[PDB]
Design an enzyme around this catalytic site. Structure first.
Site, PDB file in Angstrom:
ATOM      1  N   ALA A   1       0.892  -1.152   0.000  1.00  0.00           N
ATOM      2  CA  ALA A   1       0.000   0.000   0.000  1.00  0.00           C
ATOM      3  C   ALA A   1       0.926   1.195   0.000  1.00  0.00           C
ATOM      4  O   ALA A   1       2.147   1.032   0.020  1.00  0.00           O
ATOM      5  CB  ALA A   1      -0.862   0.011   1.257  1.00  0.00           C
ATOM      6  N   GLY A  31      -0.055  -4.968   0.813  1.00  0.00           N
ATOM      7  CA  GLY A  31      -1.266  -4.776   0.043  1.00  0.00           C
ATOM      8  C   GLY A  31      -1.176  -5.476  -1.292  1.00  0.00           C
ATOM      9  O   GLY A  31      -2.176  -5.971  -1.814  1.00  0.00           O
ATOM     10  N   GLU A  35      -1.907  -9.113  -0.725  1.00  0.00           N
ATOM     11  CA  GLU A  35      -3.326  -9.253  -0.423  1.00  0.00           C
ATOM     12  C   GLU A  35      -4.191  -9.134  -1.680  1.00  0.00           C
ATOM     13  O   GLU A  35      -5.208  -9.826  -1.826  1.00  0.00           O
ATOM     14  CB  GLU A  35      -3.733  -8.193   0.593  1.00  0.00           C
ATOM     15  CG  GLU A  35      -3.076  -8.382   1.948  1.00  0.00           C
ATOM     16  CD  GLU A  35      -3.374  -7.238   2.894  1.00  0.00           C
ATOM     17  OE1 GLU A  35      -2.993  -6.093   2.572  1.00  0.00           O
ATOM     18  OE2 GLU A  35      -3.993  -7.475   3.955  1.00  0.00           O
ATOM     19  N   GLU A  85       3.860  -5.716   6.917  1.00  0.00           N
ATOM     20  CA  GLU A  85       3.126  -4.747   7.707  1.00  0.00           C
ATOM     21  C   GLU A  85       3.672  -4.646   9.130  1.00  0.00           C
ATOM     22  O   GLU A  85       3.683  -3.565   9.721  1.00  0.00           O
ATOM     23  CB  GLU A  85       1.642  -5.135   7.737  1.00  0.00           C
ATOM     24  CG  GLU A  85       0.862  -4.790   6.464  1.00  0.00           C
ATOM     25  CD  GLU A  85       1.001  -5.817   5.350  1.00  0.00           C
ATOM     26  OE1 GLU A  85       1.782  -6.779   5.482  1.00  0.00           O
ATOM     27  OE2 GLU A  85       0.316  -5.662   4.321  1.00  0.00           O
TER      28      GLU A  85
END
Ligand SMILES: CCCCCCCC(=O)SCCNC(=O)CCNC(=O)[C@H](O)C(C)(C)COP(=O)(O)OP(=O)(O)OC[C@H]1O[C@@H](n2cnc3c(N)ncnc32)[C@H](O)[C@@H]1OP(=O)(O)O
Ligand SMILES: CCCCCCCC(=O)SCCNC(=O)CCNC(=O)[C@H](O)C(C)(C)COP(=O)(O)OP(=O)(O)OC[C@H]1O[C@@H](n2cnc3c(N)ncnc32)[C@H](O)[C@@H]1OP(=O)(O)O
Ligand SMILES: CCCCCCCC(=O)SCCNC(=O)CCNC(=O)[C@H](O)C(C)(C)COP(=O)(O)OP(=O)(O)OC[C@H]1O[C@@H](n2cnc3c(N)ncnc32)[C@H](O)[C@@H]1OP(=O)(O)O
Ligand SMILES: CCCCCCCC(=O)SCCNC(=O)CCNC(=O)[C@H](O)C(C)(C)COP(=O)(O)OP(=O)(O)OC[C@H]1O[C@@H](n2cnc3c(N)ncnc32)[C@H](O)[C@@H]1OP(=O)(O)O
Lengths: 255, 257, 255, 254, 254, 254
Positions: free
Chosen positions: E67, E105, E108, E128
């Site tokens: 992300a 991200g 994911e 993360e």
């Protein structure tokens, strides 16, 4: 064939309602193994009968069913238990329980296995299994709790105390209470109404409602949607909506 | 916006309540696709409006919503349905939504009310799922939310016969929590939405999410999630202010933060 | 030990009922950490006492428990929290809550943690956590909703409004309502009944009913079946069913 | 008696019930008649006190190439809406000895078994998509749960087949044996299971199956209840005493 | 049109919708703008009747490195509690062609896809934890369900990366292809899927996904209902008839 | 002051709490006394602010051969209804360094750990069946969920053991190390974990665990709430900033 413990017969308009009557008055309809076998037969028969759209299950005026047969279980061992009771739950057509008098233990559980429960003014529900040194073994601690809530379910299961028809209705166990004398008639009228609707659609609806106890609200709604879409693959859905739009009576062909 | 089927407006103290009124009286508020689109718009708008803490959804005095629009689906096919999929948007709204049901709340109308967090019924409200009479079954949670609120016996009776139940029946069964005279129903629902709006928005959103979780997981996991959300409230200023206000025996000043 | 916040004592026929009474009248039984520690002790003690078959938990006549102690969490931070309140759910013997007066916030949650709830004529239930800038943190949003339905649960949790004993009973939160003066006596009578049955079987039944909130109906019924089979490995099941068949009083031995 | 299957008892003291799908012509395509006999054979072995475990197999070229398409060819939606998984009602363990093709209904049948042993040249797949339909007997559920979403989606959406080695690596099957000894090896495994207490074996199988029907928390609780139950049996007393007393245990299935 | 992604129709008859993350400077860090365009491309391909399957990919060096940290660096708890998973609302199959880095991200996002193909040098991980946070888009759920608790815990708690071979072995991805042909191979697979009936394919995909939302029992019941549903389509009839008549099937997606 | 276990702090800055089962005579049989001490050591390390991760191990020949048969031999069904999985209440990560035998209760204890590292000669199995009982501490639940139904059924019903290689391939354990360096390697992994923020690590572990307690949908929702929560900590701000500022992060566990 000639039944020993139950009395069956078709009733209602167009004989669309399959009526099963537990007939073992001597033992207050104690659900002995033989009676269970006949009951399942009657259910399967009515299920396969194309003129039947709904079934009404009832017992005597004094007792729907006083429970499972203690005499038959008395000498069973743990090991026996590990070497039929819920066949009524495999029936696709709706089953209405017309409970008059006693509906205790297995009797109470049998009624709860039914889709709808109508109670006579003097019906009585309870799970006295605890008083016999055992616990309900046919969904008594599951269906009762889910319908009545933890407090009352705990009270009933742990003490074996009975509740009235009025209590059962208030708690949501049963949806209607009728005078003892007209109870079965009223349940047949309801079975009739249901029988009037499309059989395939009614089976789908019943399956959807039952799913409310087998999955999260999210997945239940998704399953319901898939079934809803499915009704569009039937002639009766087409006929039902057109009839509505055309402001005329619908003619369902269960297809 | 310039709405064709709905009437929106802010009400209550500080105009904290967003009122959405279904307005298709000739079709007794039949939920046609166009009305659904506007309803979702109104909801989204009230959701993004910081002055709004709670929404009140209502229809006419004779009907909240008599059902979906049959004429609109009468010609659809199975393939249409599958290969075509928004009836549930109201469930994506984080702020509380109260349904003020007056008169008919049938089929899709009943399902819409059940999608709301709270339901207040007018003395003459009526609930039912007549989908069976049309050769179909409820398709917007009618067999799920009704059953979970009313129990299997009554739910089966309603869904399988299409019979209606009274406001008193619905309250007794737990479908609705209050019954008010037809004339003051909406006012009363606004008062409740106001009380809710009085509290911290963020905390209210967490609570609503927690209660909803009661239908998506085991009691064990539900309690664990509730715990995590409970801990979360401690990361907010309103939690601090709220408890401080109580300890200090004074009124709380929430800032939705 | 010599408790500061609670009063314990054995009651009922043959002192088979363990009564725990919250005793912090000045704070309307606000559930402070110290009181919780003693309550857990009392519970563990009664749980291990062979003479006790059921526990009755109550507070004062004006308040069962006005809620958790706000002053104690007033200065806690998120990290404090993320880095004991429901031990009552670990007790195998049945626990009945005799709620008189206020049962708010933590007090309401404590009552809901009990297996059965009896309410005095003037009891009041509510979850005012929202008014304090927080949400119920001990099952208030889970057990309340599951017993009362979403509409009423949302109303209570989001406004902090209280409901009457009559409302709670109608909704299924509590199963009985008794006059303020006889409430505790009546709850003890219920505990007595429970205590007369087989302790081991009662524990199994309570576990079964509780399972109704932890799994699908299908799996719940399977678990119930396994527990049902288990009762057959006990002397009390054999004695219970034999007593019935031989028309005589059953003599349970909690074995 | 049987038209589509061949049954017979095998292993030590004939404690293993072997069912062999026998419709070589149709590569063991699972027609309704074969299913009816299979269920019969299963029920029979289930009730046979001498049998402790069942081994299900087909031919060397095919375990079962799939359901019978010609049989459903003309069915309509209403025919459908108005038991292929009776094998899941059997309390005794069932081992699938998969040699060759195990496709569609055949693959689902094998997955319904408690254990799957695959011959060196076995092949698994769900080609239902190529027929304009989807797996209808747990093919999208058991396959996914055993193999993971990526591979399950690949197989179900393309109808592609996977090797015995792939199946084993993915966890679909637990052993791979030469084509010629596959059935023999599966029988040896069933023998061992048959030697243990039937009642306890039934409880263990029920516990493992529960892993797919509830949360870990509830699964562990159920397992605990079953674990306590074993203490109500003579075999558990015998098994633990034999251990403590350094002697062979003699189970009585009681 | 788009600032961060490159879309285009590929495969026979342009049945494959190809979406390519195009933010090379930030190694495809999933910033909010890129997410908005990705969702647009998905919706577009979803509504495009000529498209039967979508292939999502990034660069050769990175599918998506994570992300955008810069974007959330200043957010507060309250901000967070005041559409990352839209790709999951798409009914048509989505294949992730992962080349290079697929972290945080990015990992994911790939896991949200129905199928994952990995290039020889792909790398998966959830770092993360190294940023003082935890995966927030199914990283702790989909990874665990595909890879098992041990490896999932290792990856999530240390932020360590695993190879393409590790990912395949663990079941995270179902195929590994050379970096240069990865996207081509994923398109061939998307082609195959696209060839089948769109309505039936959507039903199958929904069935497989259900394996993670309910007990095996209920999953099988749902699968059955969907299975019956296929009988209400012309494609099922055509598919089964084509098999019976030993001829090629002509699906019309209905 | 322990009789059955040996504890001690290891790794950089004594950040790793090492617990060693020490009852070699009984092959680490998990008698009630050992369990009590184990729980004590766990609670202690859990409350130690300098410890970020725990490593649990036994001897080189056996991690733990099982629960103590001698201790349950005389128990009755009724006794059973009159803290074996307390290790699951620990918030900090626990890594199991399994060398040699990890059978029955021993295998279940290892599976209760978040991560499992196995020595080259480790052996896993659930021989409960051979004793006339079934696994009673998650053996039929955690094993199945990690290894799949086929292998789990095989192990539970026969009591057969599987190798370290088998366990890794099946996903039961994520790493295999030589017998001599196993514990060292597990400590290195615990070090890495202890390096990160303890509060964030606790949240991540809780999220991964949730993958076995709810549907994918709810799991993702819970993960989201936990993800938002990390934004209420200093370590998250520090972590994101450090990455942005291309500098090393300084976690303070809050
Ligand atoms: C999966 C397997 C299924 C598991 C499901 C769960 C377990 C159970 O269902 S156990 C059943 C629980 N039910 C009970 O304990 C109720 C037993 N019966 C009673 O309490 C009383 O009969 C009651 C209160 C209903 C009525 O009393 P009363 O009006 O005096 O009639 P009563 O004289 O007792 O009964 C008449 C005859 O029916 C017999 N009977 C009544 N209930 C049963 C029963 N459950 N089993 C066997 N016989 C019964 C009586 O023994 C008597 O026969 P007889 O005098 O020749 O021996
Ligand atoms: C991990 C663990 C999770 C935590 C669980 C979830 C969170 C909660 O439980 S918070 C509880 C929410 N409950 C409340 O806010 C109710 C507080 N109580 C009241 O509002 C009133 O006492 C009420 C309405 C019950 C009765 O009114 P009234 O008869 O006038 O009594 P009142 O004058 O208000 O209070 C009397 C005394 O009781 C004390 N008291 C009552 N409730 C509390 C409480 N929750 N905390 C602290 N003190 C309390 C008051 O502080 C006051 O003491 P003092 O005069 O020395 O300051
Ligand atoms: C609840 C209700 C249940 C729902 C469950 C789910 C749905 C399904 O199971 S559908 C079944 C899916 N299976 C298939 O599509 C496989 C069909 N078969 C094949 O692909 C090939 O036979 C294959 C690849 C296995 C082998 O090919 P090959 O070596 O050339 O042998 P092949 O000549 O095709 O087969 C030999 C005979 O068996 C027949 N046969 C093979 N499979 C089937 C089948 N599934 N149904 C009916 N007949 C079959 C063939 O038609 C042929 O008979 P004949 O020549 O007299 O018409
Ligand atoms: C909630 C309550 C918990 C429920 C959880 C589930 C149930 C279980 O855990 S039951 C445990 C299952 N485990 C077993 O059956 C394994 C038993 N042990 C063995 O098979 C062998 O010891 C084995 C193969 C590991 C190694 O064999 P070997 O190298 O010859 O060593 P061995 O001589 O047998 O063992 C050495 C000593 O340890 C003892 N020992 C080994 N395992 C155990 C055990 N599980 N319990 C008690 N003592 C044990 C042996 O009795 C022997 O002591 P001694 O000679 O003085 O009597």
């Amino acid at each position: 064939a000639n039944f020993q413990y139950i009395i069956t017969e078709k009733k209602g308009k167009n004989s669309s309602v399959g009526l099963i009557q537990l007939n073992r008055p001597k033992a207050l309809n104690a659900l002995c193994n033989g009676l269970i076998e006949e009951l399942n037969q009657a259910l399967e028969t009515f299920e396969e009968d194309p003129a039947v759209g709904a079934i009404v299950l009832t017992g005597g005026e004094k007792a729907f069913a006083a429970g499972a047969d203690i005499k038959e279980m008395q000498n069973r061992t743990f090991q026996d238990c590990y070497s039929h009771w819920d066949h009524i739950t495999r029936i696709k057509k709706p089953v209405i329980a017309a409970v008059n008098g006693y509906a205790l233990g297995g009797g109470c559980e049998l009624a709860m296995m039914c889709d709808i429960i109508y109670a006579g003014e003097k019906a009585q529900f309870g799970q006295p299994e605890i008083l016999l040194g055992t616990i309900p073994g046919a969904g008594g601690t599951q269906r009762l709790t889910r319908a009545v809530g933890k407090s009352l379910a705990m009270e009933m299961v742990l003490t074996g105390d009975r509740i009235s028809a009025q209590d059962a209705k208030q708690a949501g166990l049963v949806s209607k209470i009728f005078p003892v004398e007209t109870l079965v008639e009223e349940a047949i009228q309801c079975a009739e109404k249901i029988a009037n609707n499309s059989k395939i659609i009614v089976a789908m609806a019943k399956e959807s409602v039952n799913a409310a106890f087998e999955m999260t609200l999210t997945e239940g709604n998704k399953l319901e949607k898939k079934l809803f879409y499915s009704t569009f693959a039937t002639d009766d859905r087409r006929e039902g909506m057109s009839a509505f739009v055309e402001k005329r009576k619908a003619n369902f062909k269960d297809h």
